[PDB]
Symmetry: C2
Subunit: 248 residues, 2 copies
């Protein structure tokens, strides 16, 4: 397997005091294996986390961005993030697709621009409960992935991490079973192998997210095509340490 | 007139180096009259500006927010801002109404929540060129204002600043004439006086924005119902000092 990733999506949460305490916990956890840890604070907390986070296995990610600076009140651009030292971004999270109008073509454009600007990108894909029950999971996730792929060159895939998060698993407590997740990860990896390249597919990290916790992480990671996790609720807690260690 | 406001909406712009230089300029400008200056950096630059800005006439504002923390990847909430020391927010900017789906009811809800949480709010309203040419300016701005008003109590208006920004003037170089701006500000103030209270109307700041620069600011401020400015492009430049001083 390629190098795993354990990514903490703090979403729209945190106070300075709670973040200081949690970062201390993460700093004091010695990670002995090869894993890339990622923490994605809210924009306003990025400087605090940059100042306090010292664990060498971690990088900081933004939770969203727009491609260019300019007259976009309220938004944060990729050049602005790069200038402050952030070169990872999560794009296309279900919450943004649902609440904030991010269509496949908007996500694909953002991913393309992030790659051109040198970011590592965690690009999120996943089906809704209605799509799953209609036996459309594969069509949906492949359509989301091919929309992204259409805007990328083969070289750019070195910067891409895919995160499969069934929408019905996000925040609900209803994690996908290892078999459910593995079926989708395998389908995605096969599509990448056939449509992009077998060398790309072998090195591509495909993360699972949606109700990962420290108790279910190891049995997800045991599956051959799962390369780590994008973690929401449990990444606000000290048991994120055990999620990291489940990628051994 | 009530205390004027000179507000800098930096939009999605800045680097750490350019911000450090501009904040130094603002720090070294001694303001002798009673004015509230506001600077609204991007979220990621708020901590930098908090650290460097020392001019006592300034407060820091966010350019947007959502009302509550939670599972809203990419967004920043009002409690998070309050915790970091930011208690001003711009809401309903034209760019967010246009690009990011903020309807009158979304803006009104955000304004209401911000007021409940103790923020000072700069709430933006304004008509498009098509609405102006259809002689709908008054209907539009009063409809936007009454949507906000419907969610507020009379007491909350102490926290509200209205910013009238004709959409056709934002970023285009085509500033409203003093007479155009004054006509709308007077109509707004009259509506507030009749529908909210004459005491509220007398103390309410109504700012103009849309292509304000240091040369046109003084002839806008001379009008009786203009209480300052929301400034985009020119607030990234040293001549913001002269915009502030045009509110004497």
């Amino acid at each position: 397997k390629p190098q795993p990733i354990a990514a903490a999506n703090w979403k729209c949460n945190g106070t300075t005091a709670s973040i200081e305490k949690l970062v201390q916990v993460f700093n004091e956890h010695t990670i002995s294996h090869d894993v890339q840890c990622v923490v994605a604070p809210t924009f306003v907390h990025i400087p605090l986390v940059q100042a306090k986070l010292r664990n060498p296995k971690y990088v900081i990610s933004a939770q969203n961005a727009i491609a260019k600076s300019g007259a976009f009140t309220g938004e944060v651009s990729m050049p602005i993030l790069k200038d402050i030292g952030v070169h990872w971004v999560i794009l296309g999270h279900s919450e943004r697709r649902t609440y904030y109008g991010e269509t496949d073509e908007i996500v694909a454009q953002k991913v393309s621009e992030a790659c051109k600007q040198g970011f590592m990108v965690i690009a999120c894909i996943g089906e809704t409960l209605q799509q799953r029950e209609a036996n459309q999971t594969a069509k949906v996730v492949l359509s989301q992935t091919s929309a992204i792929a259409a805007k990328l060159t083969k070289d750019a895939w070195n910067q891409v991490v895919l995160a499969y998060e069934p929408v019905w698993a996000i925040g609900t407590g209803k994690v996908a079973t290892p078999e459910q997740a593995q079926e989708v990860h395998l389908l995605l990896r096969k599509w990448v192998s056939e449509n992009i390249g077998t060398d790309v597919a072998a090195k591509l990290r495909i993360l699972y997210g949606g109700s990962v916790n420290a108790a279910n992480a190891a049995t997800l990671y045991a599956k051959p095509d799962i390369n780590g996790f994008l973690v929401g609720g449990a990444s606000l807690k000290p048991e994120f340490r055990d999620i990291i260690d489940a990628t051994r």
